[PDB]
């Protein structure tokens, strides 16, 4: 009975993108969209298991290339309109259309066409068989065509979906407000009438909110505060793909030289970062994946701290007096890693580095997407979309979204080989493990964008106030199925 009760939560990530699922890659926007939008099939935020959302029943697989999905009876958008098969077609076609510049088409490269057969059934035709078809549907949220066509920017700021919570408002550095969608008839109806996410990127403010009872759960517990929070709260730390990456503009001298990119990895003392910033709750990367991922295989290139090796590579690359600027995001823990990275690099005999911090939204729109940068450290976690290896590789390495328009490595022979390998692993599934490891090993040698560390992710919540809350293995918070005591 969502009347008389509310949920308040502390979210760690500022709003850095809008909410249009065409482009909403910001951590806090994606988390909101788990509640505002539905796919045809969604993955549970905690268990990652698929469940029927806008699909009325299990997708009917006619053959390896053909699936039919029927819409849940009575499904409605938050404006009171029915969800239609045209809305489904529109949602997939806009992601697939290169002109629309989605951030996510590289997660559905196997879809050939989406067609409305009648007012209930949609036909999906695939380019080749893809066993994870249903699992990927969670990425393509179903949007109301009549709203989006009336103004994409307005929809991006005020999203309308079919999920159990309706968007009320979002105010930067303040809060996102949701309300129960009382016409939702899926599996996870809103258990409270109103939910407020306070945007508390400041570590201390976020912890204080939990301690004071201003919120019932907080994302991304600062490691230093975990012990004191345990007195009155549950604190649980979950193994995660979530990582800190080092990203180079590979078309700007001298970071177009792989030896320079390698050198800067070798120059970093990861154990010091882990001790000082993460309190042991992270591991230096030894592959693309974290070592607890089921598909982890250790990469053939390792970057254990070795200053002499860094110096040797720089001398081979002809570096005698390199001065560059590192851009970093503003996440409190990224701000803590940055000076330590700078100290390690400034200790090199031929490198001097300065630092600039920026909010993530401006970092991408004003610098990265234009190529107006040299080197970035930033956090990333595409495991929000799913946990399969093609997906995690594709986010950063399939197509153009990052390799062409962000880290600018798409003109290399190595990039083209990686594309062939990523395609082979999904078009020839019997060869996938071999093909993925070849791609990962090229990526790990070339280090265009590569993890420095993967981290354990702690969440805190009050079990006396919330029912059925569980922490995620990804960024965000989930209140699907969660109520108040
Ligand atoms: C799926 C994913 O990894 N999203 C990440 C995004 C994107 O890197 C950014 O929006 C550019 O697309 O940035 C963050 O929101 C951020 O830096 O605050 C972290 C988040 O984990």
Tokens of 247: 């990203």
| Dihedral (CA of 278, 281, 285, 289) sign | negative
Pick the closest to residue 269 from 184, 344, 189 (CA basis): 344
Mutate to test the pocket of ligand 1, among 11, 333, 379 (most ligand atoms within 8 A of CB): 379
Distance 360 CA to ligand 1 centre (A): 8
The domain segmentation of the chain, as residue ranges, is: 1-238+457-485, 239-456
Distance 25 CA to ligand 1 centre (A): 6
Separation CA 144–CA 132 (nearest Å): 26
Separation CA 422–CA 438 (nearest Å): 9
432-446 and 258-266 helices cross at what angle (nearest 10)? 80
Using alpha carbons only, how large is the chain's radius of gyration in Å? 23
Ligand 1 atom 5: the closest Cα is on which residue?
Answer: 380
Distance 66 CA to ligand 1 centre (A): 33
Measure CA of the first residue to CA of the last residue in the chain; give whole Å: 12
- CA 364 to ligand 1: nearest atom: 11
Q: HSE, CB side, 13 Å, CA atoms: give it for residue 416.
A: 3
Tokens of 16: 């850095």
Neighbours of 139 (CB within 10 A): 19
| Long-range contacts (CB closer than 8 Å, 24 or more residues apart) made by 253-256 | 254/317, 254/319, 254/322, 255/324, 255/374, 255/375
Ligand 1 atom 1: the closest Cα is on which residue?
Answer: 382
Task: List the beta bridge partners of residue 457.
Answer: 238
The distance of Cα 461 from the centroid of its chain, to the nearest Å, equals: 22
Pick the closest to residue 143 from 19, 32, 16, 15 (CA basis): 19
Distance 69 CA to ligand 1 centre (A): 31
> Measuring CA to CA, how many Å separate 410 from each of 78, 93, 256, 365, 394?
41, 25, 11, 20, 14
> Measuring CA to CA, how many Å separate 335 from each of 129, 137, 359?
44, 35, 11
Helix (H), strand (E) counts: the chain: 15, 21
Distance 415 CA to ligand 1 centre (A): 22
Distance 17 CA to ligand 1 centre (A): 9
Ligand 1 atom 11: the closest Cα is on which residue?
Answer: 25
Exposure of 416 by Cβ count < 10 A (0-12 exposed, 13-18 middle, 19+ buried)?
exposed
Distance 20 CA to ligand 1 centre (A): 15
- CA 395 to ligand 1: nearest atom: 1
Neighbour-count burial for 420-440, b at 16+ CB within 10 Å, e otherwise: ebbebbbbebeebeebbbbbb
- CA 378 to ligand 1: nearest atom: 17
Resolution of this PDB entry, in A?
1.5
Distance 107 CA to ligand 1 centre (A): 16
Q: What is the 3-state secondary structure (H, E, C) of 118-136?
A: CCCEEEEEECCCCCCHHHH
- SS3 percent helix, strand, coil of the chain, rounded to 5, is 30, 25, 45
* Residues within 6 Å of ligand 1 by CB: 13, 16-17, 25-27, 103, 329, 360, 364, 378-382, 384, 475
> Measuring CA to CA, how many Å separate 197 from each of 28, 222, 308, 400?
9, 18, 48, 33
Q: Which residues contact 121 (CB under 8 A, 6 or more apart)?
A: 68, 69, 70, 71, 85
Distance 410 CA to ligand 1 centre (A): 21
Residue carrying structure tokens 């550095």 = 173
Mutate to test the pocket of ligand 1, among 24, 27, 246 (most ligand atoms within 8 A of CB): 27
Give the containing element (helix H, strand E) for 460. Answer: strand 457-461
Pick the closest to residue 452 from 162, 234, 218, 248 (CA basis): 248
Using alpha carbons only, give the angle 352, 353, 355 rounded to the nearest 5 degrees. 160
């Amino acid at each position: 009975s969502p009347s008389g009760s509310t949920i308040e939560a502390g979210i760690a990530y500022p709003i850095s993108t809008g909410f249009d699922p065409l482009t909403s890659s910001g951590a806090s926007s994606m988390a909101a969209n788990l509640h505002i939008f539905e796919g045809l099939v969604d993955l549970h935020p905690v268990t990652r298991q698929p469940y029927l959302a806008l699909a009325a029943k299990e997708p009917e697989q006619k053959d390896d290339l053909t699936y039919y999905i029927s819409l849940r009876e009575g499904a409605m958008f938050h404006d009171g309109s029915p969800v239609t098969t045209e809305d489904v077609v529109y949602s997939f076609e806009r992601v697939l259309d290169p002109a629309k510049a989605s951030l996510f088409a590289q997660f559905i490269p196997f879809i050939a066409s989406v067609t409305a057969l009648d007012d209930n059934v949609v036909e999906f035709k695939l380019k080749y068989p893809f066993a994870l078809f249903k699992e990927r549907l969670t990425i393509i949220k179903i949007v109301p065509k009549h709203i989006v066509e009336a103004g994409q920017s307005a929809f991006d700021a005020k999203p309308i979906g079919s999920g159990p919570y309706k968007f009320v408002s979002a105010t930067k550095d303040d809060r996102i407000v949701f309300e129960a969608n009382t016409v939702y008839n899926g599996h996870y109806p809103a258990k409270v009438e109103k939910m407020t996410w306070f945007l508390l990127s400041d570590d201390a403010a976020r912890v204080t909110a939990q301690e004071s009872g201003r919120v019932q759960a907080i994302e991304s517990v600062p490691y230093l505060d975990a012990e004191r929070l345990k007195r009155k709260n549950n604190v649980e730390s979950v193994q995660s793909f979530g990582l800190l990456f080092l990203m180079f503009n590979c078309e700007k001298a001298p970071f177009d030289n792989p030896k320079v990119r390698q050198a800067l990895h070798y120059a970093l003392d990861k154990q010091k970062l882990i001790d000082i910033v993460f309190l042991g709750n992270a591991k230096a990367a030894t592959s693309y994946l974290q070592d607890t991922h089921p598909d982890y295989v250790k990469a053939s290139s390792q970057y254990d701290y070795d200053k002499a090796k860094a110096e040797k590579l720089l001398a081979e690359a002809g570096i005698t007096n390199l001065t560059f600027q590192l851009l970093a995001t503003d996440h409190a823990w990224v701000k803590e890693c940055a000076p330590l990275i700078l100290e390690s690099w400034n200790a090199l005999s031929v490198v001097k580095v300065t630092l600039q911090h920026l909010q993530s939204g401006a970092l991408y729109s004003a610098h990265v997407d234009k190529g107006a940068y040299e080197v970035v450290i930033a956090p990333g976690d595409p495991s929000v979309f799913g946990n399969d290896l093609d997906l995690l590789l594709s986010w950063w390495y399939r197509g153009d979204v990052w390799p062409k328009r962000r880290f600018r490595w798409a003109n290399t022979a190595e990039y083209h080989e990686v594309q062939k390998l990523l395609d082979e692993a999904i078009k020839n599934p019997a060869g996938s493990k071999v093909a993925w490891q070849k791609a990962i090993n090229i990526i790990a040698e070339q280090v265009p964008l590569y993890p420095i560390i993967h981290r354990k992710l702690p969440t805190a919540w009050n079990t006396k106030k919330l029912t059925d809350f569980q922490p995620l293995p990804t960024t965000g918070l989930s209140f699907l199925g969660v109520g108040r005591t």
